[PDB]
Structure 1
Amino acid sequence: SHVKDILGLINAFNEVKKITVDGTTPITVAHVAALARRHDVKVALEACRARVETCSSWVQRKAEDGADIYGVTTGFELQESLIRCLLAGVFTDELPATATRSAMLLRLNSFTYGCSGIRWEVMEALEKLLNSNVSPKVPLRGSVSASGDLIPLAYIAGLLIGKPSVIARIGDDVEVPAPEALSRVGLRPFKLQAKEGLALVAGTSFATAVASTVMYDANVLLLLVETLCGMFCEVIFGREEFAHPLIHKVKPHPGQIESAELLEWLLRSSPFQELSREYYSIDKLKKPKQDRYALRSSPQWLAPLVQTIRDATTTVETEVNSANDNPIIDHANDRALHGANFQGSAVGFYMDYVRIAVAGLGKLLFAQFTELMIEYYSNGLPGNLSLGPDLSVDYGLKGLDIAMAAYSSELQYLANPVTTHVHSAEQHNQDINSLALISARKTEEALDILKLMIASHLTAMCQAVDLRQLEEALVKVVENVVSTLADECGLPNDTKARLLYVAKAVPVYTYLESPCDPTLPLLLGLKQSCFDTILALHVDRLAEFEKRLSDRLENEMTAVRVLYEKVRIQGSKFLPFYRFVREELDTGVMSARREQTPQEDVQKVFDAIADGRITVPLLHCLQGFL
């Protein structure tokens, strides 16, 4: 199951201490993201040294004898004129330090295969620069990722040779010219030898770097969305039967089988499904017999998205663990091979697909959130998940709802392809080019939006948990009060049962605002039954009932709500999430008596998604799934 695979990526991301760069051990997207995000993670380049020096020697010696090799004795001092012409970005905005360090890692890794001809010493400086948090400041734009990420990779090369015009960061604050930065790590500027410039600049390392953190994020956010579909079922009063294994067995898209399996398992002994079953047995024939598509067709919807994100992961890893410059030095057979491994099309095209898949995840979230906000579609929940009880001053999550439309709309726009925009480039030499870095940045942007939408959805769902539990205790108060008052006023066993059915059946949020308002559904249902009881038994005791109802009911309803603001989740697989958001992030049910704005509440959830903390409640939630 892709589920086990993704938990694998998360475990690795958290547990990895050193990244082994040795020309044999595969680097994964977790490793790339870990190096990028956790500064305690160190590169360990393992002396593959033999093959690196053999390649390096071959190239150097062939250059002497005038072998006719491209980018060595051919046009594109020959090496540094190439760096100079490629130092051609503009600061308008820049590639982030995380992407630059990831790129330095991928470049280093590509050299270990012994196909590039770079000197072992250059690799050692790359390793050292990474472990000392030194990285060049790199302009955002300029690459078409075809002869590689030439311009942005020239800033790494520019660092290595001490161009005074390249600015390096050292940690978060220090910014000094490149020669100054090499001084501080005990390095001197390299003087580039044969093919070394081309080896440094002509790779896929920048696109593939952005694509790696993109793909680790996509795997994690994917599993998160899938999981939260289970939570959505619980709060919306869904029918877990949509995830029945036979439905998916007869339409066996692997991602449709696997997501449904996660969901069946997540809901098997759900105490919320218990409540759902009961809700649908009351007024049985007046409520929908099936859920709406955002829940009911989620496994069918998730299927191509799972498969896209998983296959794209394989592709980006293949790229990560590749020699991606040119020529490819085949030293064992004494020849330089002329190809185009720097063409970043594998990554470019899969970035376009992943952005569309991410947009599809966003649309699933939007549709679920929309249902949750509307009383006609939320099976008892109040509009905008407003607690009130005074609705005139509690518009609930309305602002978050409007934002969810804004998020989804911009996200769908972003998912148009970049790879359809190929220009005939570089004096028409690069007449196909992958635009992979550009596509990877757009997909990254799309993930930024998905994270916002996940944060909002989880927040709304936590709010829905509270509202559902509050509903269960509120109904019990109404049932108790109606029951005991019926005793006091000495009403018949016909009238009692009839009035208790009403107490059980009316959705409490329809009259929470003013429980004894004669125009609201509680007293309407009660009036109806009172008339029915009269004709069936054919009064003083009834009229005293109605009076004694506006003595006890409202006060006892307030009392219980007030208690709650100062349970079924405990038995739910989603407890870890609820506990995380309520306890660990220090939040509570949203209302006019809670000072914090939606911003303050969702910011906490968003930050937790952004920094990886969300993976703890997620891993807890899924414990035991096999």
Structure 2
Amino acid sequence: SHVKDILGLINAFNEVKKITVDGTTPITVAHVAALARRHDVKVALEAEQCRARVETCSSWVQRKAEDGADIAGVTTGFGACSSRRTNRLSELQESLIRCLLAGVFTKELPATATRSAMLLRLNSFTYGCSGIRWEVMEALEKLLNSNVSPKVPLRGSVSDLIPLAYIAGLLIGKPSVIARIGDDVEVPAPEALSRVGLRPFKLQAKEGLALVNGTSFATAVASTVMYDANVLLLLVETLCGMFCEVIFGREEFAHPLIHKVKPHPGQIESAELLEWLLRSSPFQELSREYYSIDKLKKPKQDRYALRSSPQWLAPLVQTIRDATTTVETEVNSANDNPIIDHANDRALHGANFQGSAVGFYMDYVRIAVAGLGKLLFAQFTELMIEYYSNGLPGNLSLGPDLSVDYGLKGLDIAMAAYSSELQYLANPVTTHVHSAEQHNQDINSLALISARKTEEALDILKLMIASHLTAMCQAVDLRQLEEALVKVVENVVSTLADECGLPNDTKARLLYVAKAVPVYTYLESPCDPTLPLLLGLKQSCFDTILALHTDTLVDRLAEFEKRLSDRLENEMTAVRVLYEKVRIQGSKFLPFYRFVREELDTGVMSARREQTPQEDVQKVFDAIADGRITVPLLHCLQGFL
């Protein structure tokens, strides 16, 4: 299952301490993300594996260039200018870098992406096709492990000459290039090199081109994008189960036979996960009891945001998993040109610098992320509306006084804003190819641009997941309070039926109403005669007077109402206050509920809780952003397959 594969990525992300870079061992997206996000993670460039290969290629290129071999961008001009020959080998390479230091700082790429790119460029060199000197690769390793990286302008690549030239610029000690050292220091490139015991390199044949002629920045951003897309995908799938529990869904939507006869792999696998999460759920028992009361006046099936979730998820799962493979292939490639086949004495002229595999798949993933967002939006919408939430209060407002408690209405508005922007972001970037660079680059991938937009889409999806999880924790509390309140109402009604000495017929009629009327429809003023509890009791009292048909019966029914009116509300208040100062204990989603309530320190939302919705959702968002959310996710899933 893809579920196992994603769990695999998460564990690798958590567990890795050293990234082996040797030209044969694969780098995964989890490794790239770990490097970027955990500074304890170090790069290990292995000499025994690949130094010999690199040195053979290096000396082949320098020897061949000095003897006047005709090789593009080595004894030849760049791009549209490859007709121009020259024997000024070093100055050809110097002139390239000067030409490409052409980005502009408005008011930049983050260090996470820049360090990831440096890693990917280093990896590309290990295949021994580039002609770069081993010593430069050692410098890249040292800069990575010492937290040194250049400040890079955001824009300029059609996919990654301009942004990579800033890495080259650091390596050759260009004084105009500014480098970070950790989080606090920044200094000119030459001073950065001296602080980590390096000297500026003088570029030899092909070395300038080797540094800049790759897909490292697009593929770097795409790598962290795809790691995040996997984690958030699994989180969304998992939380569809929690949604079923709180909304009072019918778990039959996940039955394996439904998906066996429409066997999209992502449909089968998401449904398999959901069935396991919901099997013998204590919340699904509450749902079953709810639909057994007044059965023929309630919906036979759930709305699509739940019932249709495996079908919806199918292409989204498949897109994210297929895109991960493609991105990792790019990570583990010689993306450079010319390709030096030193063994056969040939410089091979192609276009491995073309970022098209990444570019197209970034467009697809962004569409899939918008699909995940729409699912979340539709589920959240149902949850806020009492007509669609099967007993829950509008806006998940606890009240009891709803006139000063609008619950999660602000989050609901925000969810619409999030979905809307996300759907806009999902238009493609690859459809905007311009004929570029003196019409030499008449097709180009725009991969870094697309990756950056998919990254922005995932930021928004994070926000949407944080809100949805926060709302579902609120709904857990309201369902647990609901169960407790109905028991109080039944007890008061039963006891008072005895105290006032009503017949059995009457008593049982009244107890059915107490059981059947949704408690959140009258919690605000339980004895208000226009609200649904009294409305139901009154009609039951009229029927019982008709069925028994007297003055004594009426005396006692009148006494029942008075006694209700001095006792009911206080006992309902008491149980709610106790709750504020249990089905979730048997739910697979207990680790999420515990995480949010205890570890992040929150509570049921109400006018008596002074923390804003922002304060609560911020805590959840931060835990999603920094990876802490994977702990309850893995806890929730333990034992699965």
Please confirm whether the aligned pair reaches a TM-score higher than 0.5, indicating the same fold: yes
Give the secondary structure class of the aligned counterpart of 1:186: coil
Asked if structure 2 preserves the Cα contact closer than 8 Å seen for 1:388 and 1:592, the reply is: yes
Q: Name the residue aligned to 1:549.
A: 564
Provide the C-alpha distance between the structure 2 equivalents of 1:123 and 1:459, rounded to a whole number of angstroms: 47
Secondary structure at the counterpart of residue 292 of structure 2: coil
CA distance in 1, matches of 2:241, 2:256: 15
How far does the alpha carbon of each residue in 1:214-237 deviate from its partner, in whole angstroms, 9 at most, with x for none? Answer: 000000000000000000000000
Which residue is equivalent to 2:57? 55
Q: What per-residue deviation string (whole Å, max 9, x for no partner) do you get for residues 447-469 of structure 1?
A: 00000000000000000000000
- Structure 2 distance, partners of 1:115, 1:167, is 30
Contact 1:103–1:206, Cα closer than 8 Å, also in 2: yes
- Determine the C-alpha separation between the residues in 2 that align with 1:468 and 1:78: 72
Alignment partners' CA distance in 2, 1:427 and 1:526: 84
Tell me the distance in 2 between the aligned counterparts of 1:299 and 1:393: 39
Deviation digits for residues 473-528 of structure 1 (CA, Å, limit 9, x no counterpart): 00000000000000000000000000000000000000000000000000000001
Give CA deviations for 1:41-60 in whole Å, capped at 9, x if unaligned.
00000001110001101001
Between the aligned partners of 2:476 and 2:54, the Cα distance in structure 1 is 59
Matched residue of 1:252: which SS? coil
Distance 1:59 1:537 in 2: 107
Q: How many residues align?
A: 623
Aligned partners of 2:587, 2:279: CA distance in 1, in Å? Answer: 10
| Aligned equivalents of 1:8, 1:80: Cα separation in 2 | 44
Query: How far, CA to CA, are the matches of 1:17 and 1:528 in structure 2?
Result: 71
- Work out the CA distance in 1 between the residues paired with 2:130 and 2:544: 92
Q: Which runs of 5+ in 2 are unaligned?
A: 79-90
Match among 91, 97, 106 for residue 105 of structure 2? 91
**Separation (CA, whole Å) in 1 of partners of 2:515 and 2:404:** 28
Partner SS for 2:108: coil
Contact kept in structure 2, 1:93 and 1:140, CA below 8 Å: no
- Looking at structure 1, the residues matched to 520 and 339 of structure 2 have their Cα atoms a distance apart, in angstroms, of 70
Q: Which runs of 5+ in 1 are unaligned?
A: none
User: Matched residues in 1 for 2:566 and 2:542: separation?
Assistant: 22
1:269, CA displacement in angstroms? 1.4
Tell me, yes or no, if structure 1 residue 326 matches structure 2 residue 337.
yes
**3-state secondary structure, aligned to 1:329:** strand
Counterpart for residue 14 of structure 2: 14
CA contact (8 A) 1:93 1:139 kept: no
Hey, what's the Cα distance between the residues in 1 that align with 2:496 and 2:20? 74
What SS does the aligned partner of 1:377 have? Answer: coil
Q: Find the aligned partners of 2:304 and 2:31 in 1 and give their Cα distance.
A: 37
Using the alignment, how far apart are the partners of 1:545 and 1:526 within structure 2?
10
Cα offset, 1:541, TM superposition: 0.7
Q: 1:14 to 1:93 in 2, by over 3 A?
A: farther
Residue 145 of structure 2: aligned partner: 131
State how far apart, in whole Å, the 1-side matches of 2:135 and 2:226 are: 31
Is contact 1:516–1:550 with CA below 8 Å preserved after alignment?
yes
Contact 1:227 1:262 in 2 (8 A): yes
Q: Distance in 1 between matches of 2:621 and 2:503?
A: 56
Instruction: Give, in angstroms, the shift of residue 93 of structure 1.
Output: 6.8
Q: Hey, what's the Cα distance between the residues in 1 that align with 2:168 and 2:302?
A: 57
Per-residue CA deviations over 1:88-134 (Å, capped at 9, x if unaligned) read 00000700000000000000000000000000000000000000000
Q: Provide Cα deviations, 1:18-46, integer angstroms capped at 9, x if missing partner.
A: 00001000000000000000000000000
Q: What whole-Å deviation, never above 9, does each CA across 1:177-209 have from its counterpart, x for those lacking one?
A: 000000000000000000000000000000000
Superposition deviation, residue 551 in structure 1: 1.1
Does residue 513 of structure 1 match 2:513? no
CA distance in 1, matches of 2:119, 2:364: 25
Distance (whole Å) between structure 2 residues aligned to residue 299 and residue 380 of structure 1: 25
Shift of 1:256: 0.1
Length-normalised TM-score, structure 1: 0.99
Report if the CA contact (8 A) 1:69-1:336 is conserved.
yes
2:604 match? 589
Instruction: Answer whether contact 1:27 1:320 (CA < 8 A) is retained.
Output: yes
Cα pair 1:111 1:323 within 8 Å, conserved: yes
Runs of 4+ in structure 1 off by over 4 angstroms are none
Instruction: State the alpha-carbon separation in 2 of the partners of residues 385 and 423 from structure 1.
Output: 50
CA distance in 2, matches of 1:210, 1:93: 22
Encode CA deviations 1:414-443: one digit per residue, 9 max, x unaligned.
000000000000000000000000000000
- Between the aligned partners of 1:314 and 1:19, the Cα distance in structure 2 is 19
Q: Check whether the contact 1:163–1:179 (CA below 8 A) recurs between aligned residues.
A: yes
Q: Deviations over 1:134-156 (max 9, x none)?
A: 00000000000xxx500000000
> How far, CA to CA, are the matches of 1:377 and 1:429 in structure 2?
58
| Post-superposition offset of 1:560 | 0.2
User: Which of 581, 585, 594 is the aligned partner of 1:570?
Assistant: 585
* CA separation of 1:480 and 1:245: change in aligned 2, threshold 3 A: same
- Secondary structure of the equivalent of 2:289? helix
Whole-angstrom CA distance in 1 between matches of 2:619 and 2:241: 22
TM-score (norm 2): 0.97
Report SS of the residue matched to 2:60: helix
Contact 1:345 1:436 in 2 (8 A): yes
CA distance 1:300–1:423, change in 2 (3 Å): same
Which secondary structure does the structure 2 equivalent of 1:376 belong to?
Answer: coil
Match of 2:574? 559
Conserved? CA contact 1:328–1:336, under 8 Å: yes
**Aligned-pair CA distance for 1:546:** 0.5
